[PDB]
Amino acid sequence: GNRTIAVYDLGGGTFDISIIEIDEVTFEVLATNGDTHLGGEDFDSRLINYLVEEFKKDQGIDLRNDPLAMQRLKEAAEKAKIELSSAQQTDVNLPYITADATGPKHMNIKVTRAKLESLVEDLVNRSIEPLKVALQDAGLSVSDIDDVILVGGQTRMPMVQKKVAEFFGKEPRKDVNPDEAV
Numbered sequence: 001g002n003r004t005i006a007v008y009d010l011g012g013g014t015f016d017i018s019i020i021e022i023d024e025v026t027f028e029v030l031a032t033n034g035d036t037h038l039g040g041e042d043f044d045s046r047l048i049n050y051l052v053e054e055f056k057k058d059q060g061i062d063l064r065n066d067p068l069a070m071q072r073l074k075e076a077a078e079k080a081k082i083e084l085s086s087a088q089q090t091d092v093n094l095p096y097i098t099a100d101a102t103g104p105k106h107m108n109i110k111v112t113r114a115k116l117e118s119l120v121e122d123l124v125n126r127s128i129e130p131l132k133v134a135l136q137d138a139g140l141s142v143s144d145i146d147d148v149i150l151v152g153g154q155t156r157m158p159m160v161q162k163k164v165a166e167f168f169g170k171e172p173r174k175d176v177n178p179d180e181a182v
C-alpha cells in the first residue's frame with residue numbers, strides 16, 4: 001500500500017515543491033522543483049506599492065524618498081497581510097509618518113481582503129508552474145497524488161489554499177508536520 005504525497009512549501013523567500021513516495025515492505029524523493037524568487041516577501045511588496053499609491057493619491061507625497069518611513073510601511077504591510085488571512089478587512093495606521101509645509105502627516109488606509117487577493121493573484125499563479133514540471137519529471141499526474149501538505153506561513157492565506165485545492169482536486173492538509181507527513 002504505497003502512498004505518494006506532494007509538499008508545497010512557500011516561505012518568506014523561496015518556493016519549493018517535492019513529490020515523495022512511501023512504501024512499507026522506504027522513502028524516495030521522486031522529484032523536486034521550485035522558484036528561488038517567489039516568497040512571502042513578494043506578497044508584502046505588492047501591498048507596499050498599493051499603500052504608497054494611495055498615500056500619494058490622498059496627500060500627494062511620495063514616501064519612497066524617505067527611508068525611515070519605508071521601513072515602518074514594510075512592517076505595517078506585513079502585519080496587515082497576516083490579519084487578512086483571518087479577517088475580511090483591516091486598517092493600516094501609522095501616525096506622524098512624514099511631514100510638509102502643511103504640517104505632519106498620518107497614514108490611515110483600509111485594506112480589504114478582496115483588494116489583497118487581486119494584488120497578489122499573479123504570485124499565486126506563478127507557484128503552479130513548477131508544480132506541473134515536477135509531476136512531469138516524476139512521470140505522474142495529479143490523480144497519482146494521494147495527499148497535499150502545505151508548509152510555510154504564507155500558505156495560511158485562504159487564496160493560496162483555494163488555488164492548490166483546485167489544481168490537485170483534493171483539500172490540502174495544513175495540519176500535518178514533517179514526521180506525520182511521511
Ligand SMILES: Nc1ncnc2c1ncn2[C@@H]1O[C@H](COP(=O)(O)OP(=O)(O)CP(=O)(O)O)[C@@H](O)[C@H]1O
Pocket residue numbers: 010011012013014015039040041078081082083085151152153154155156157
Ligand atoms: N497568517 C499568515 N497569513 C499569511 N502570511 C503569513 C501568515 N503568518 C505568517 N506569514 C508569512 O509567512 C512568512 C514566514 O515564512 P517561514 O518562516 O515559514 O519561512 P522562511 O521564510 O524562513 C524560509 P525561506 O526563506 O526558505 O522561504 C512571512 O513572509 C510572513 O509574512
